[PDB]
Amino acid sequence: AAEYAVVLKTLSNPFWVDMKKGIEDEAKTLGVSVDIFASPSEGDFQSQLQLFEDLSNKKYKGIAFAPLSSVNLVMPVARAWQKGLYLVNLDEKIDMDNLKKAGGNVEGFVTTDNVAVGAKGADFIINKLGAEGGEVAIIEGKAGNASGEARRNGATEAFKKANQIKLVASQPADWDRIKALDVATNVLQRNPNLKAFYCANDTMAMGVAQAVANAGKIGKVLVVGTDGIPEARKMVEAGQMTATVAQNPADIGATGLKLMVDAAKTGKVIPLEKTPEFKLVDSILVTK
Numbered sequence: 165a166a167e168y169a170v171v172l173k174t175l176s177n178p179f180w181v182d183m184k185k186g187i188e189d190e191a192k193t194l195g196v197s198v199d200i201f202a203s204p205s206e207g208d209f210q211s212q213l214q215l216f217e218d219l220s221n222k223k224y225k226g227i228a229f230a231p232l233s234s235v236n237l238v239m240p241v242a243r244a245w246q247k248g249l250y251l252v253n254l255d256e257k258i259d260m261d262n263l264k265k266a267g268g269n270v271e272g273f274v275t276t277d278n279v280a281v282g283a284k285g286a287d288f289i290i291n292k293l294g295a296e297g298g299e300v301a302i303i304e305g306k307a308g309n310a311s312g313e314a315r316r317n318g319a320t321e322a323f324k325k326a327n328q329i330k331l332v333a334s335q336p337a338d339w340d341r342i343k344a345l346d347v348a349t350n351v352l353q354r355n356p357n358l359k360a361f362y363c364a365n366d367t368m369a370m371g372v373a374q375a376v377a378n379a380g381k382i383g384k385v386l387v388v389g390t391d392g393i394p395e396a397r398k399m400v401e402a403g404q405m406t407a408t409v410a411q412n413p414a415d416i417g418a419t420g421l422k423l424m425v426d427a428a429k430t431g432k433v434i435p436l437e438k439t440p441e442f443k444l445v446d447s448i449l450v451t452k
């Protein structure tokens with residue numbers, strides 16, 4: 165068993181594959197051992213709670229964790245803090261009000277500025293649609309995820325400020341490729357004059373881009389994603405997606421691990437009362 169455990173959402177999403185590799189490479193730089201785990205799919209809330217608990221009860225100094233929902237890991241993360249494990253929240257913000265209520269804390273939280281991610285994707289669309297503007301739609305993450313909520317808020321506020329843009333639809337496809345295909349199909353049907361989708365992640369952006377293709381609207385409806393996964397990058401170069409707001413999962417993982425190891429070296433977990441460390445990882449727009 166390694167000194168440190170990691171719990172990622174799921175390796176069915178390349179974002180988490182790239183975070184795993186970032187963490188493995190950072191461990192070699194710090195000279196520490198990590199055991200990395202994930203859930204089989206996006207919806208395995210219950211399984212992930214049971215996975216965390218079971219890791220919490222081995223001999224790990226620390227756990228870095230990306231929860232599948234704001235709430236699902238609150239109780240086991242509280243228990244791990246109480247037992248004196250060095251905890252780092254990766255990327256998807258744990259409900260900190262409910263964590264405090266449960267008598268827990270984390271050393272730190274590493275994430276992207278996901279309001280700026282939404283703004284950046286929206287701002288690209290606004291500039292591409294020019295003075296004519298027109299109708300836009302947001303394909304959301306699952307409700308009750310801070311990461312998705314920030315991107316929706318960022319893109320919605322950017323759209324709102326452009327008089328020539330109308331946000332006609334803003335609805336979830338739950339980080340799911342097949343749900344995004346079906347939701348985006350419906351949005352195009354309901355809105356024949358749609359000019360653009362902003363999508364809260366690439367898994368969903370690839371479904372949306374399939375929906376746009378099926379309606380024979382490749383190039384006439386913009387598709388902007390989020391993460392910069394390889395298949396989304398290929399689609400952007402091939403002209404099937406317009407753009408993606410690239411994140412750096414490898415850096416979020418490397419940063420998270422270093423925050424956990426740095427904390428562990430102090431020999432005392434964060435006091436219940438203390439604000440956790442907060443580290444942002446940049447995003448960039450990628451177009452063809």
Ligand SMILES: OC[C@]1(O)OC[C@@H](O)[C@@H](O)[C@H]1O
Pocket residue numbers: 177179230254255256311312339364365366367390391411
């Ligand atoms: O961990 C939150 C997040 O939003 O979960 C979904 C992933 O595709 C990424 O976008 C990631 O940043």
